[PDB]
Amino acid sequence: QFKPPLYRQRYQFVKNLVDQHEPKKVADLGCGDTSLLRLLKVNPCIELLVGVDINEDKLRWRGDSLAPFLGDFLKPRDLNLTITLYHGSVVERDSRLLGFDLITCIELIEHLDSGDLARFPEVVFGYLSPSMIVISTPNSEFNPLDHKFEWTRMEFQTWALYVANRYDYSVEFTGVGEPPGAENVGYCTQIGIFRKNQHDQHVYKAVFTTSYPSLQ
Numbered sequence: 001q002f003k004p005p006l007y008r009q010r011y012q013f014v015k016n017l018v019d020q021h022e023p024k025k026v027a028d029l030g031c032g033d034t035s036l037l038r039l040l041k042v043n044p045c046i047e048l049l050v051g052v053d054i055n056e057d058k059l060r061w062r063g064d065s066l067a068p069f070l071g072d073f074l075k076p077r078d079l080n081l082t083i084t085l086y087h088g089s090v091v092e093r094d095s096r097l098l099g100f101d102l103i104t105c106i107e108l109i110e111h112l113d114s115g116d117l118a119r120f121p122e123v124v125f126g127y128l129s130p131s132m133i134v135i136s137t138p139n140s141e142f143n144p145l146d147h148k149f150e151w152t153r154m155e156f157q158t159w160a161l162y163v164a165n166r167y168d169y170s171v172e173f174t175g176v177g178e179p180p181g182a183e184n185v186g187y188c189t190q191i192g193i194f195r196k197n198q199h200d201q202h203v204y205k206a207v208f209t210t211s212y213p214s215l216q
């Protein structure tokens with residue numbers, strides 16, 4: 001139904017933001033397969049790539065291939081690249097994720113229960129407070145044409161507009177997935193791109209960390 005798969009369109013949407021803004025530190029919350037990290041590491045602008053996920057099993061053996069290879073030594077990077085996979089939750093605050101340039105929450109909020117969803121903005125926007133946060137979730141108005149909830153365009157936009165004003169951000173709405181008769185349904189995936197206008201807290205469990213060789 002979608003020429004390139006919808007999950008890949010979501011990944012390419014974030015890659016395009018990365019290409020346009022060149023963030024140095026990037027964290028993907030709910031990274032799952034690590035498929036997004038693998039796409040974003042293509043870009044040489046990133047100096048720190050990070051992944052977080054509650055599911056430790058989903059991260060098993062997926063770190064190994066993110067480490068440098070013999071090619072990366074022979075033809076080296078300009079600056080260091082550190083990659084780190086963490087076993088943790090977005091609801092818990094971890095100081096190693098402060099000062100990031102971009103945080104991505106792709107198809108994650110729908111997996112948060114009411115209680116967890118009430119704490120998510122207090123952490124990602126409130127505590128971490130990166131320069132840019134991207135949250136994507138499905139549009140329930142596309143369904144006629146496990147998730148704890150299925151929000152419409154208004155429901156999401158109203159939650160988003162309250163958060164944007166609370167934690168001092170500006171939110172823009174877009175998406176991926178053409179309808180294509182009946183164009184009024186909107187995109188398949190709703191996207192909100194938020195743009196911003198010292199105790200140690202190590203909660204997460206770093207499952208894998210690697211660093212690349214470099215030379216300027």
Ligand SMILES: Nc1ncnc2c1ncn2[C@@H]1O[C@H](CSCC[C@H](N)C(=O)O)[C@@H](O)[C@H]1O
Nearest residue numbers: 030032053054055088089090106107108111
């Ligand atoms: N509280 C939480 N903290 C961190 N990760 C969470 C979480 N609740 C759910 N997740 C993770 O979020 C993911 C949802 S699906 C992963 C989506 C992925 N970015 C993609 O577009 O393919 C799962 O990997 C799940 O384990």
